[PDB]
Design a protein around this ligand. Structure first.
Ligand SMILES: Cc1cc2nc3[nH]c(=O)[nH]c(=O)c3nc2cc1C
Ligand SMILES: Cc1cc2nc3[nH]c(=O)[nH]c(=O)c3nc2cc1C
Ligand SMILES: Cc1cc2nc3[nH]c(=O)[nH]c(=O)c3nc2cc1C
Ligand SMILES: Cc1cc2nc3[nH]c(=O)[nH]c(=O)c3nc2cc1C
Ligand SMILES: Cc1cc2nc3[nH]c(=O)[nH]c(=O)c3nc2cc1C
Ligand SMILES: *[C@@H]1O[C@H](CO)[C@@H](O)[C@H](O)[C@H]1NC(C)=O
Ligand SMILES: *[C@@H]1O[C@H](CO)[C@@H](O)[C@H](O)[C@H]1NC(C)=O
Ligand SMILES: *[C@@H]1O[C@H](CO)[C@@H](O)[C@H](O)[C@H]1NC(C)=O
Ligand SMILES: *[C@@H]1O[C@H](CO)[C@@H](O)[C@H](O)[C@H]1NC(C)=O
Ligand SMILES: *[C@@H]1O[C@H](CO)[C@@H](O)[C@H](O)[C@H]1NC(C)=O
Ligand SMILES: *[C@@H]1O[C@H](CO)[C@@H](O)[C@H](O)[C@H]1NC(C)=O
Ligand SMILES: *[C@@H]1O[C@H](CO)[C@@H](O)[C@H](O)[C@H]1NC(C)=O
Ligand SMILES: *[C@@H]1O[C@H](CO)[C@@H](O)[C@H](O)[C@H]1NC(C)=O
Ligand SMILES: *[C@@H]1O[C@H](CO)[C@@H](O)[C@H](O)[C@H]1NC(C)=O
Ligand SMILES: *[C@@H]1O[C@H](CO)[C@@H](O)[C@H](O)[C@H]1NC(C)=O
Ligand SMILES: *[C@@H]1O[C@H](CO)[C@@H](O)[C@H](O)[C@H]1NC(C)=O
Ligand SMILES: *[C@@H]1O[C@H](CO)[C@@H](O)[C@H](O)[C@H]1NC(C)=O
Ligand SMILES: *[C@@H]1O[C@H](CO)[C@@H](O)[C@H](O)[C@H]1NC(C)=O
Ligand SMILES: *[C@@H]1O[C@H](CO)[C@@H](O)[C@H](O)[C@H]1NC(C)=O
Ligand SMILES: *[C@@H]1O[C@H](CO)[C@@H](O)[C@H](O)[C@H]1NC(C)=O
Ligand SMILES: *[C@@H]1O[C@H](CO)[C@@H](O)[C@H](O)[C@H]1NC(C)=O
Ligand SMILES: *[C@@H]1O[C@H](CO)[C@@H](O)[C@H](O)[C@H]1NC(C)=O
Ligand SMILES: *[C@@H]1O[C@H](CO)[C@@H](O)[C@H](O)[C@H]1NC(C)=O
Ligand SMILES: *[C@@H]1O[C@H](CO)[C@@H](O)[C@H](O)[C@H]1NC(C)=O
Ligand SMILES: *[C@@H]1O[C@H](CO)[C@@H](O)[C@H](O)[C@H]1NC(C)=O
Ligand SMILES: *[C@@H]1O[C@H](CO)[C@@H](O)[C@H](O)[C@H]1NC(C)=O
Ligand SMILES: *[C@@H]1O[C@H](CO)[C@@H](O)[C@H](O)[C@H]1NC(C)=O
Ligand SMILES: *[C@@H]1O[C@H](CO)[C@@H](O)[C@H](O)[C@H]1NC(C)=O
Ligand SMILES: *[C@@H]1O[C@H](CO)[C@@H](O)[C@H](O)[C@H]1NC(C)=O
Ligand SMILES: *[C@@H]1O[C@H](CO)[C@@H](O)[C@H](O)[C@H]1NC(C)=O
Lengths: 292, 292, 292, 292, 292
């Protein structure tokens, strides 16, 4: 059976003439094909004001090393070892379109190497990634956030992203967003390789949101009623003023929460603006009739 | 008695052929059984909006090293030493379901080793850990937060979590949450070992929260009274407007504080929505009678 | 006179067989007695909502090294040297009950050693330390915050905290809190040594805070007057509504500022809740008389 | 074809007598001309209150090394290598006028070197850079933010910034700001070289912002109408009070959002101040007529 | 002319027997006189609530090394070199009274050394420094913030701060604060040397702030008028209620923005408290007359 001394001998022979900075290819004309695996874990939040989405992934990287091989029959059947992450060449994959907020406590600093040369490098990653958040169809809105990977500095004739396999690990249930992360995509080559996983997010219709929407709709009903109310009732100006106050309060309220960076504004805010405008016309008619 | 030179000799012989990256097992076919001890210290806060709980623990890790042993009679009865944490193999246990916000000033960077090979590694850990926070039965609500541990990269045929022993250290009294963290659980094996401690949290009924609840119930009494008030009293419309304003203010107020990510929304918020809806019907009846 | 070469020779001979990881004792059965000196500098703030106090200290640590000694007559009267902090054994004293937010720019990374073996290691420390904040007697409230020190990993039969000497350096004046940090306490031995300095904090009565009180008290006077006002004045309901609105606004206002984690809630908040309840009874009486 | 051994030999000969701290020039009297390339990627946000702009760039640095050269025919046609960033001399370019908030996960830590000595060093950079934000012509306002580069410590007789080439990479579309970053500028020599890229930012007129502006203009129309309303209508004081309340609410609202650091304040805020002042005069006239 | 080999030889001879931890003095009885140069760059903000001021400086440190000298005629006229900052003894100057928030990206990590031994060490430094902020004469207020320097651990018989030369670099114009930072001060010796630069800050009277102050004065005029209004006008109680509401809103508004840590509170806040108190007396008189 394999022993501690056997693994020590294997590692000592393995790292004899290894240069961490030289790409692991016998012939430097060949590229190293990297395939990345991005398994989402949890979607913490979708920050509307800052246009970010907070999530935790399981970014994995697989490639082939041609210098790190051995016949396992020569080393008591040792088929795999674990190396420190900083002793071996590692592709310079970056979270190109993201602010990476992972800590050193979430850095594994180790990798799995197989006797055929295949290396697995799996790392937890918490990302604050930019998303173009369009609140047009709020609150029945859908959105697309693309998580980008791009080789840092090696040209496509040196390092390439063969594929990106993205899935959802179903670790936790959201109850607010319906996430749809599935599919395989080849890498895109434009002077440096890069790929991206599309994340589709649909807001789930909760009874809490519809209960928060109920006051707005009934307020619209009340505006319609007062607009239809006789000018000579005598309470027109009073309740019109009070409900214009409340409507303006709701408009300010939504305005501080609605995203400012959208292809179009939200239909609901524009509809409440229209409501305020109609309330203004109702107040105008009431005062005009009052003077006349 | 043991001396500085004796301990120096022991350490020098001990670390002679130690490789930090090779699992500490004579036969590599055997697994290293790690038992983790997680003693909660203080529950700083339960953040509803961000779905996190802030706490400080005493995560301890115990395993057995087969290479680091000695007969203490051969070294003047030295029974235990202290080694720097980065010179010895350390299992790659991670706060899998948490954002670790500990500093390097909270890193001990040392471990205690016994002549039989047993290693103790105790470390303070401040965690921002994800919890599925359900505010259904607010404010008489209970919640369950699971703190996850999972070996990083070694397969179950290499490293396993034998057990997880979780307790409460009673270092401080909370006065807001009743914490119940006790029990022992074996590790779960699904391609990589992992375990979790269930934390049960019950909000304690404080005289302050019931005091804050008094305005709401008396507001309900007032709504009922005005709904029962004669249409021809003359104060119907005015008081309905003022108390609809107050109801909407309380609804907005709670809505900015209630969690948006819940299995069900909070009954109290839905009950205040019902209150506002009834106030709207009262206003509708008052205005209808006023016109007719 | 001592020279650069003399100090170089002394240091070279001093560090010849020094192991940073071996406790500095000739006989390992003896403990190293550490006496800590904690001189407060400034009390930045007392965060009520998060139950923290922000301050900057001058934590100093003094102990005795038995391996690092020399006869100064043998080295041209060199009586003291300065060593890098990471080359010498350092007791693992931790800010056990605090989040340490000091930077590496505030780390001295150097220590003073005397020819008798006595080492002084003084470091600035900015601490976010947990305090059980009771707002019962607000705003004439007092509080006690305990700053904890505890040896990290060495058992009491290896390392002990001999004493904790805490004082106030009077570097700056507060004008908001009266701080009382003075006294000497022996270390407490329960499986690992630890000590704590009790810091008493009394809010100073400022003319600004009494001014902010003035509206509340006069509002109470106004509530009493309107409660005494004749039911048949005709303005009862109007002022009752307006002042209940204002009362509820003040109640919400204080509620968002009062701590939620207290042994008892603040009497002033409960008194304003009683004021709101009395306003509700006044409104009830006014409407009842109005209908009847 | 070039091989791993060939690249190893080349690197070994290349770094034989290289000193990282000695400028890479045969004759030390000559300066090293650095040309910087700053390609903006995304303009995250323009923080008005803090006077910052958040963006992500592609800062590249190109210069010439005279010690690192080779005849490629002597090494099997190896024309370029990759070196670790910390083994070679690197110009000390700093984001002089900015808070750099990039992480170590966004640090490439490698550079591309060509057989002629030309080095390319491209790095992602997220900057929180100070801008003098003038909100005079709000919301039809334009602004100029200058991104500064300046050599850290070398005098102009040692290191110079030859040029700064700035462009927009069009990676993402903004939809809120029209960005205009294009042009080439020579370095400025005043005791230490430095250059800056001017960033012009124009707020795009969105249908959302005009919708938000509608309430204000109609409120002005209403103020004009009530100012023209007959003093003897009887409702003058009532609507004057209500609309002064609303005006003051809008004034406070904008005041908490308008920048406090401007060459001139925003005309719209001053116009709403004028509107409130006119409302005050209208209230004064109404009350004066009411008493008389 | 000097060459790369010449500088290499010079550095190799220079660092032959250099100990980074030994003060650079031939005779250890002499002190090293450090003169610091602190050139302010920009005053980002003056945070009233947290009592901090955010600024970026150009902290320079100059001293004399007696071991690092050479005759330049012996090395082809090399008159100055650049050394890595961590290879040479550096005085342990700390921003004693400040939170240093500089990044490693703003650390030069290099220093300029002259053949006479004079070393220049210039570094950008962004400081969050404590200031005793007195808002007595708000908004026509002036303030003094002292930036402290103090040697970390060396006694005055080892290291001394010869002088502190502070100036304003005029890099940017403020438009909100008039800064006056100029003058020279000797170091202060009380067991460890230290010095401080006094920075005077005067708020500039902006047309925006006076515009914000207009509502308050006109509100005072309105309070005076209603106090003078006939008790029997009929609008007394109504307008007193509405303007007491507005006064209380402004009082809360300013109270959340006024500093709580001042030698005296702000006169304007106390004046608005007096205004609210007078409004309360006016309301009291109106209601008293109404009942009687
Ligand atoms: C290494 C590197 C090369 C790059 N080339 C680039 N080339 C280009 O034409 N446009 C870019 O925006 C660009 N960005 C780069 C960023 C990095 C980090
Ligand atoms: C090392 C490692 C392996 C993993 N394998 C994994 N395997 C799998 O089937 N699903 C996962 O989500 C997964 N995550 C991993 C994460 C890490 C850090
Ligand atoms: C080294 C160490 C030992 C400990 N022992 C401990 N022992 C115990 O009984 N309760 C604890 O909470 C505890 N905490 C510890 C923390 C550390 C860091
Ligand atoms: C190295 C260095 C030199 C400097 N010289 C400087 N020289 C000067 O006249 N004014 C400055 O503001 C200034 N700042 C400097 C900053 C640095 C970091
Ligand atoms: C090295 C050092 C010595 C000190 N001495 C000190 N001595 C003293 O009498 N009072 C202090 O506050 C004090 N603080 C110190 C801080 C440091 C970091
Ligand atoms: C490693 O490189 C050296 C060159 O210094 C060579 O002598 C040796 O044979 C090489 N060994 C292997 C296993 O490649
Ligand atoms: C490298 O190229 C040579 C050229 O013939 C070829 O024989 C060799 O197989 C190549 N190396 C690999 C690993 O394929
Ligand atoms: C080596 O180990 C593998 C693991 O299952 C086994 O299948 C194989 O038979 C072993 N071979 C030898 C020669 O031990
Ligand atoms: C996810 O989206 C893809 C393409 O947009 C679609 O084919 C697939 O059916 C979707 N799946 C779910 C579960 O929404
Ligand atoms: C992706 O790459 C594979 C492998 O070469 C190829 O077969 C396939 O056609 C490519 N395109 C897609 C869409 O998969
Ligand atoms: C350590 O390993 C070396 C192999 O280089 C061997 O010669 C030596 O005997 C070993 N010593 C021990 C104590 O295992
Ligand atoms: C390793 O396996 C061999 C096989 O017989 C056994 O004799 C030995 O005891 C094992 N090692 C340990 C530490 O159990
Ligand atoms: C070694 O120390 C232990 C500690 O209690 C003691 O029990 C034992 O008798 C000692 N043995 C010898 C041989 O000193
Ligand atoms: C804690 O919970 C467990 C399981 O829910 C239960 O058996 C135990 O009695 C509880 N203890 C306390 C103190 O609530
Ligand atoms: C846990 O592991 C132990 C040790 O093998 C075993 O005896 C026990 O049955 C397992 N299950 C539980 C619930 O303890
Ligand atoms: C230091 O330890 C070595 C052991 O290798 C010994 O030979 C030497 O005499 C010791 N010197 C001192 C000063 O203790
Ligand atoms: C250590 O113990 C021995 C036992 O007699 C004693 O002689 C010696 O003085 C002790 N060491 C010290 C430093 O006291
Ligand atoms: C050594 O220095 C101290 C310092 O004051 C002095 O008192 C003492 O006389 C000196 N002794 C010798 C021998 O120089
Ligand atoms: C501080 O508190 C201690 C104990 O509570 C007391 O003895 C002492 O007089 C107090 N000093 C001041 C200045 O309050
Ligand atoms: C503290 O320790 C000292 C030193 O042993 C002792 O004299 C004293 O009695 C202890 N207790 C107190 C309260 O000081
Ligand atoms: C490198 O420098 C050494 C000086 O120690 C010299 O002997 C050698 O010839 C130099 N080699 C090259 C390639 O410059
Ligand atoms: C350095 O100066 C000498 C002086 O004549 C000149 O010959 C040489 O070409 C210069 N070096 C370079 C690289 O131009
Ligand atoms: C070296 O490689 C370049 C790359 O295109 C090629 O143009 C050139 O002909 C090659 N020369 C030799 C001698 O192989
Ligand atoms: C950008 O600004 C420059 C100078 O201000 C001008 O020449 C150029 O036309 C502008 N381009 C755009 C697209 O606005
Ligand atoms: C900039 O530098 C270049 C190169 O020396 C020079 O030709 C040009 O005149 C300079 N000025 C401008 C505006 O380009
Ligand atoms: C440096 O110190 C060594 C002591 O090991 C001495 O032999 C040598 O002469 C010294 N050289 C210089 C230049 O001081
Ligand atoms: C050190 O002191 C001696 C004592 O005479 C003196 O000669 C020498 O000049 C001093 N060193 C320096 C650098 O002044
Ligand atoms: C050395 O360089 C300086 C720099 O200006 C010059 O003034 C001096 O004449 C030069 N001396 C020699 C000997 O080259
Ligand atoms: C700055 O203040 C000093 C002393 O307070 C004074 O002498 C000087 O004239 C002032 N300068 C300015 C520009 O305010
Ligand atoms: C400051 O130090 C200098 C140099 O020793 C001295 O001339 C001066 O008198 C001291 N005092 C002042 C106020 O400059």
């Amino acid at each position: 059976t394999p022993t501690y001394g056997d693994e020590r001998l294997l590692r000592e022979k393995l790292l004899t003439n290894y240069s961490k900075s030289i790409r692991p290819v016998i012939n430097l004309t060949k590229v190293v094909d990297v395939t990345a695996l991005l398994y989402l874990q949890t979607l913490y939040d979708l920050d509307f004001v800052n246009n970010f989405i907070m999530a935790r992934y399981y970014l994995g990287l697989i490639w082939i090393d041609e210098k790190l091989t051995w016949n396992p029959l020569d080393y008591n059947n040792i088929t795999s070892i674990y190396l420190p992450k900083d002793k071996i060449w590692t592709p310079p994959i970056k979270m190109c379109n993201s602010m990476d907020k992972s800590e050193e406590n979430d850095g594994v600093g180790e990798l799995m190497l197989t006797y055929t040369g295949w290396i697995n490098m799996w790392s937890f990653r918490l990302l604050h990634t930019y998303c173009q958040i369009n609140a047009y169809t709020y609150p029945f809105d859908e959105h697309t956030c693309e998580i980008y990977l791009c080789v840092a500095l090696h040209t496509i004739n040196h390092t390439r992203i063969k594929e990106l396999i993205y899935e959802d690990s179903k670790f936790t249930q959201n109850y607010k967003w319906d996430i749809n992360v599935s599919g395989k995509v080849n890498g895109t080559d434009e002077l440096f390789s890069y790929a991206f996983a599309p994340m589709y997010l649909r807001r789930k219709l909760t009874v809490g949101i519809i209960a928060m929407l109920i006051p707005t709709v009934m307020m619209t009903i009340l505006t319609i009623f007062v607009f239809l109310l006789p000018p000579e009732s005598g309470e027109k100006v009073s309740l019109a003023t009070t409900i214009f106050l409340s409507n303006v309060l709701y408009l300010v309220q939504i305005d501080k929460t609605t995203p400012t960076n959208t292809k179009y504004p939200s239909l609901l805010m524009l509809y409440l603006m229209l409501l305020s405008m109609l309330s203004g016309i109702a107040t105008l008619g009431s005062v005009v009739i009052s003077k006349l």
